[PDB]
Design a protein around this nucleic acid. Structure first.
Lengths: 97, 51, 23, 123, 200
RNA sequence: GUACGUGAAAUUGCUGAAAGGGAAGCAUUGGAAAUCAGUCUUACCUGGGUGAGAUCAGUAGUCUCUCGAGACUAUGCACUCUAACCUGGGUAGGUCAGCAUCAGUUUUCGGGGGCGGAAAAAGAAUAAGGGAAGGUGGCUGUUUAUAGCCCUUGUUGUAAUACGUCCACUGGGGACUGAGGACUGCGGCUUCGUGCCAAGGAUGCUGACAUAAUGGUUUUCAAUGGCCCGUCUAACACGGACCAAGGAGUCUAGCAUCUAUGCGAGUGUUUGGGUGAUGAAAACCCAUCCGCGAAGGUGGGAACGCCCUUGUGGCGUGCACCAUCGA
RNA sequence: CUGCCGAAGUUUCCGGAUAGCAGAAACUCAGAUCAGUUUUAUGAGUAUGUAAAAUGAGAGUUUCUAGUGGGCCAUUUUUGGUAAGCAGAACUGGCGAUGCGGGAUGAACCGAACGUGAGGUUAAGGUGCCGGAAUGUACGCUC
RNA sequence: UUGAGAAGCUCAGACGAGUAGGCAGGCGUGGAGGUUUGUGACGAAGCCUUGGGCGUGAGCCUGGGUCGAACAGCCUCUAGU
């Protein structure tokens, strides 16, 4: 619902394996209360919740197998990097998406 | 029994509970074709277009 | 018991042609 | 069942805000000259049986447990089988010692004591 | 029940088919054709309970009318027609087609058992009260109601007065003058159809 | 601190915060400030190992009750059980946000097709005939020519659309509600064991939070409403400076109704007498008077038998009460 | 303090009555016992009353017991009336006991009769601003 | 399936102004008998409160401050309520 669909030209997603993602893929990392050895009241640490090596790896992977696809469509690499912002003088209902 | 008043026009399950005919209706039967004939008498059209 | 109202019937106009009036 | 109130502002006897002799507890007016009795619009409302609340979520605190005055240590014992529908409200004149022993036993029965903290400063 | 329904459903067409046929004959012949008259009428109240003459107050009691916007199914004859004219500025009647006689007993169909208002959401609700007159379901009840039969009095006393809402889209402009000068009161004939397709 | 137990209201002064453009007062919905509460503190639940023993002992004794049921004192802590510690795995209620498939009520866009009228009228295209003009080309006057128009019929027609309906035909969009609490039922799909289902009222998937998100309560602001109370008989008049405490259908006799209880052709001890060691004016017992009172048939009809037309109906006994003829 | 039922405000005789309206029990009948009602039939000089069809609805009997015989209007006949009002008799309703939307505020006007709320839809009346809703559509009027 | 305070429990419909009047259930105050193995100098009653809670309401329960000797709930009786 918080996505506005767009009739902008499409691409090929047959090369990317989206079935790797499931509803447990984006599940949060389970706070789980690992034993803190109650002295932890004093000493504090942090895992920096860093993105694991698996996430940064596939991010390079899935992008590498769609970047040439949007390179084929002109004005598409630079269509993505911009943002959307309606302006005074525009009215979303009558404009087409 | 009967906690809610279900509507047999807008619910398609209570309708079949009340009316065991919804499995054969065929509301729109093609009882005519291209060959429909005009049936308009001359003396009726004379009293029609009179005055 | 009540006297029932009137069902349908034809009425031929070969001897009685409908005349046109004006108010 | 979530508790609900049909009204939250209590009723307030007519012109009991102006005069200090007239108290705020409700008294139905008795004169047919009255604007209020004839129920003219704009005047204050009245207690009626319409504002009666749900017959199951009545007498319940906003949490859901009804109250119960426990005035000694064997009045909280009856609440052993009713710890999820009653809150052990301690009575007001109970001493600040007999109070600290109801709390230590109601806590074993899992009963919510609503005002266990009175006169009891903890260390 | 379906064996009764198949008989009824084909019969509604087979009487609607002939008035298609029996007018296609006369109009192509020069003959004229009065129709099978309305024998059912459907009366919907228009005015409240305030400032009603006592003569017209009794009559609307004798037509199960105790509230503004109540429809009832009543048998239409001479002694009904002269009774409606004396309550004419407080009611509104007209011919119901087969669709309103369906949508009023499927949506707002409430029976009368033990002087209680019990809905028509089960055939056993109808079989209990009207079993002894061979009425077995809503479809038997619709046939007996709309195609007037002998038990129509014994079936119109079953259904409650049809308590309807105010018509989506409103009434006309000024309500309590006779229908034939704008407004809506008295007979509406086929246009009581397009009034129930608003309240319902 | 003798202006002395507690020390309410009117009422007065100071301090703090507000508000106030020839009216405040209050009610409703909320903003701002202040402040308050909520269990959320933690708890829960699940294995192994280590130790402890008891309701355990292929165990010995005491007492109270009734063979064994509890309370015990030994001794072991094996077999069972629970349980402290160490070791590990999984796991709210509280509030507020979403989103999904639903149910109820409802509103607003459509999509498709039947069925009807002059089997809509038009119209288009195409053959006849007729007519003319607000007279075109041509020459003010004329009849399709170098524009065309109208009327009638044929034909494309076995026409479209519109209008009025109907679909137990279909795509969506928004809104409020979630009452009830094992299964009982009506149903539909099944897949032949079943089970499942939009089918007798909501469940599921997540996310924020306890130096907290919501929720209140006060002062005030905004919007909208709001003729001063009681007695009178539209306004009035009459009462009202305010606060506190007092203050008005009570007791008794008689009569009648209703209800309750005790006894019942009876009923009522208390004028008295007897008794009462523990308020002995109580309770309890009671003589002789006395007061009030003191079975006729015929029709229904409550109920109950026997029925056999299941019932219906028949058939018998018929209370109170009511008619009918007896006295 | 809350809840339930809830009138008359006119008689009929003689301040007392009876009836009525509201009530309590007992006891009747599930029937044609009824009905501020409409049909059809008989008559009667479109109206009049009488009886057995429609339509609805369960009806009935007494016993014992409170309040109540004020009026303000609106409705139509209406005779006496006239500069001009009007005066009076009868019928029907409201209000008295009734709040609510409009009618700018008003009891006699238009709608509507009320438990506590949410969501929808309307009546009356409205949609230029105050004021929630079309400076909408159509055709004719007016200086 | 336990929901037998049968004075309880449970299912379903309709209804909701109200004057004189009629009926019913409750709230509160002072004393009396019974009861709470009742509360109280670790603070009873009272009083005040920009605190919280319940009931439709009469009212009740409670936190904080003040204060200093008595007091309340339940079932009945009683009225100078």
């Amino acid at each position: 619902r918080y996505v506005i669909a767009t009739s902008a030209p499409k691409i090929d997603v047959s090369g990317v394996s989206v079935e790797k993602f499931t509803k447990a893929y984006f599940a949060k990392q389970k706070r789980s209360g690992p034993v803190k050895k109650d002295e932890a009241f004093f000493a504090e640490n942090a895992p920096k919740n860093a993105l694991p090596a698996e996430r940064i790896a596939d991010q390079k992977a899935v992008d590498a197998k769609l970047l040439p696809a949007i390179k084929a469509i002109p004005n598409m690499k630079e269509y993505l990097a911009a943002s959307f912002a309606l302006s005074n003088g525009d009215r979303p209902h009558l404009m087409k998406f | 029994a009967h906690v809610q008043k279900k509507n047999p026009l807008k619910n398609k399950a209570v309708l079949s509970r009340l009316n065991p005919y919804a499995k054969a209706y065929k509301a729109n039967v093609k009882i005519n074709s291209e060959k429909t004939p005009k049936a308009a008498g001359e003396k009726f059209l004379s009293v029609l277009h009179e005055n | 018991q009540p006297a029932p109202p009137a069902k349908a019937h034809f009425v031929s106009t070969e001897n009685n042609e409908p005349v046109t009036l004006h108010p | 069942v979530n508790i609900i109130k049909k009204r939250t502002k209590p009723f307030k006897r007519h012109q009991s805000d102006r005069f200090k002799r007239v108290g705020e507890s409700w008294r139905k007016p008795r004169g047919i000259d009255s604007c209020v009795r004839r129920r003219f619009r704009g005047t204050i409302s009245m207690p009626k049986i319409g504002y009666g609340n749900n017959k199951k979520t009545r007498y319940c605190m906003p949490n859901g447990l009804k109250a119960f005055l426990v005035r000694n240590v064997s009045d909280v014992e009856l609440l052993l089988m009713h710890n999820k529908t009653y809150a052990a409200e301690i009575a007001g004149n109970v001493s600040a010692r007999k109070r600290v022993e109801i709390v230590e036993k109601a806590r074993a029965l899992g009963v919510k004591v609503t005002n266990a903290g009175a006169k009891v400063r903890s260390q | 029940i379906a064996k009764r329904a198949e008989a009824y459903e084909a019969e509604y067409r087979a009487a609607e088919r002939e008035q298609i046929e029996l007018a296609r004959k006369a109009r192509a012949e020069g003959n004229y054709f009065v129709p099978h008259e309305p024998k059912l009428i459907f009366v919907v109240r228009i005015r409240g309970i305030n400032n009603i003459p006592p003569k017209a107050r009794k009559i609307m009691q004798l037509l199960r009318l105790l509230q503004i916007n109540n429809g009832i199914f009543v048998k239409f004859n001479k002694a009904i027609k002269e009774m409606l004219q004396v309550v004419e500025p407080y009611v509104t009647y007209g011919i119901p087609n087969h669709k309103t006689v369906r949508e009023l007993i499927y949506k707002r169909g409430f029976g009368k058992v033990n002087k209680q208002r019990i809905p028509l959401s089960d055939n056993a609700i109808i079989e209990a009260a009207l079993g002894k007159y061979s009425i077995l379901s809503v479809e038997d009840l619709i046939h007996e109601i709309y195609t007037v039969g002998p038990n129509f009095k014994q079936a119109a006393n079953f259904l409650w007065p049809f308590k309807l809402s105010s018509p989506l889209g409103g009434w006309r402009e000024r309500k309590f003058k006779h229908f034939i000068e704008g407004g809506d009161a008295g007979k509406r004939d086929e246009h009581i159809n397009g009034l129930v397709q608003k309240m319902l």
